From a paper:
In this study the crystal structure of the Fab fragment of 7C8 is presented, providing the first structural analysis of an HIV-2-neutralizing antibody. The monoclonal antibody 7C8 binds to V3-peptides corresponding to the stretch of residues 326 to 341 that contains the FHSQ epitope. The antibody 7C8 was originally isolated from mice immunized with a 15-mer peptide, derived from the V3 region of gp125, and corresponding to residues 326–341 (SGRRFHSQKIINKKPR). It has also been previously demonstrated that the specificity of 7C8 is centered on the stretch of V3-residues 330–333 FHSQ. The three-dimensional crystal structure of the Fab fragment of the mouse monoclonal antibody 7C8, specific for the third hypervariable region (V3) of gp125, reveals a deep and narrow highly hydrophobic antigen-binding cleft with architecture appropriate for a linear epitope.
The three dimensional structure of the Fab fragment of the HIV-2-neutralizing V3-specific monoclonal antibody 7C8 was determined to a resolution of 2.7 Å with Rcryst and Rfree factor values of 22.6% and 27.3%, respectively. The asymmetric unit includes two 7C8 Fab molecules, 78 water molecules and one glycerol molecule. The overall structure of the 7C8 Fab fragment comprises the four immunoglobulin domains VL, VH, CL and CH1 that form the variable (V) and constant (C) domains of the light (L) and heavy chains (H). The binding site of the 7C8 Fab is formed by the six solvent-exposed CDR loops CDRH1, H2, H3, L1, L2 and L3, which project from the β-strands of the VH and VL domains. The elbow angle, which is commonly used to describe the relative orientation of the variable versus the constant domains of each Fab fragment, differed significantly between the two 7C8 molecules present in the asymmetric unit with 138° and 184° for 7C8 monomer 1 (chains A and B) and monomer 2 (chains H and L), respectively. However, it should be noted that the conformation of all the residues comprising the six CDR loops is identical when comparing the 7C8 monomers 1 and 2 in the asymmetric unit. Five of the six CDRs in 7C8 (H1, H2, L1, L2 and L3) display conformations that correspond to canonical classes 1, 2, 4, 1 and 1, respectively. The CDRH3 loop of 7C8 comprises 13 amino acid residues and is therefore elongated with respect to the average length (8–9 residues) of mural IgG molecules. Qualitative analysis of the electrostatic surface potential indicates that the two sides of the deep antigen-binding cleft are positively and negatively charged, respectively. Importantly, besides enforcing the importance of the FHSQ epitope for recognition by 7C8, the two models provide a potential mechanism for neutralization by 7C8 as the size of bound full IgG or Fab fragments would not allow for subsequent engagement of the gp125 trimer with the co-receptor on the target cell.
Author numbering:
A (entry chain B): 1 to 30, 30A, 30B, 30C, 30D, 30E, 31 to 212
B (entry chain A): 1 to 52, 52A, 53 to 82, 82A, 82B, 82C, 83 to 100, 100A, ...
The structure:
Amino acid sequence: DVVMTQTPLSLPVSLGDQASISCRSSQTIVHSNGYTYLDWYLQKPGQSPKLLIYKVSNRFSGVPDRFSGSGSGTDFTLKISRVEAEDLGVYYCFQGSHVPFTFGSGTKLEIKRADAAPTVSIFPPSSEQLTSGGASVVCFLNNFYPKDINVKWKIDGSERQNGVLNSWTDQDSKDSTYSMSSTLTLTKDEYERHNSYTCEATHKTSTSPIVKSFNRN
Amino acid sequence: AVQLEESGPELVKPGALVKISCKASGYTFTTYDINWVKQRPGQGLEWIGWIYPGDGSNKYNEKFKDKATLTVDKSSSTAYMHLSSLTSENSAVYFCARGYGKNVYAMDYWGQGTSVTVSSAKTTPPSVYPLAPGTNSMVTLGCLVKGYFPEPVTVTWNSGSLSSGVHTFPAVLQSDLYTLSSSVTVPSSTWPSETVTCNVAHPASSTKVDKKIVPRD
């Protein structure tokens, strides 16, 4: 197997700056017939992988000239000049010269932007859910930079740890921010047993936590 | 327009068999390699093999020779992959790609992929709960999608009208059931003076739910 080793595995690039990805290889991708079937692909979150570069340097139609590929035999590079926000996703180098055909591991391209506070929103369980006998309390932490964030739940002003599930977004393709959602799930009985429910985010952008709360009545 | 239509999601019990299908349009099917690529939940692409529909000749990656069988149907321009003896670690997204042939030197058109989940759990549709606030000029509304199986679930607001300010979070699995949320932000003068509705699809259960978000009384 021709091992494809990509450096780095993570690429933090500022908006407008050049971004280069290195692909090294176990053997020569120069095929018996003389051609070099080395390709670059792009997989944006939630999409199929798309062809960007073929045969080392040739870019697939519809791919902007901002993308260019170079290198030879064992060593290869892909450069993205003047990076845009919609460029983020995973970049793969790929060899089609020697069976089996092999991909490199991913190069994740993340972008750097200005600091942004999270917009915090708290929601009581809906009437529909209460009727089923469950009671989820959902809190949104939206459009913040950078990645790091934490949530503390309080039932009646006391920290609740058990029963909480969290989910983080991939980087947004428009405004380049991250997002998070937290869900405290209870029984209607457990939920009706208490009164105040608070959601608090700590971010690096503020000293104090953003506190959003509601009372069951 | 070159196109590759892959079958819908699959839930199959451990130690079973699945037949994945891929329908080609917009080019001469019989003169281009069809490739398959595995992608496990998390990261990474892995090449399974190609079939040449013209004469049914193939090449497999050794690792997959015992689990993957490639066939083709010329008459319907369809390519097929059969996956056998199914483990949990076989739960992945499997892609279709047109490869080698006249003026094609890479995998230039990919199918949308087919998500294959291997579990003994039961297909169950989501319950979609509304999320409304308990003038900022900007208001954040949401939908809770809870208790469905398997993946995926697509969420869309007002039949696609609102793309901006839309965040749908990765699902979190607990006790054989997935839960995700999605949020949307709109100017306050457009809610609830106008209708905001989330559209959840669950292809595995063939279920669409459309929930309208109305204020609390």
